[PDB]
């Protein structure tokens, strides 16, 4: 994302593979999450993998 000001936050756009209602036929899905509710997954250099 891009706001560049710091006076306002944005919400991080995150995407995830979902177990659909017929279980084993996945489809990727996205939702907006407030930043305090999301954490990076690992100490590795990947800045694009996050965990709740």
């Amino acid at each position: 994302a891009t706001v560049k000001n710091g006076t306002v936050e944005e919400m991080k756009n995150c995407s995830f593979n979902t177990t659909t209602e017929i279980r084993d036929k996945e489809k990727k899905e996205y939702a907006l999450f407030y930043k305090p509710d999301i954490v990076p997954l690992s100490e590795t250099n990947n800045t694009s993998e996050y965990r709740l």
């Binding site: 659909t20 209602e21 907006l32």
Partner: peptide
């Protein structure tokens, strides 16, 4: 978003 059978997860 669907979360398993018959139940939904609301999101922004």
């Amino acid at each position: 978003v669907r979360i398993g059978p018959g139940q939904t997860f609301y999101a922004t």
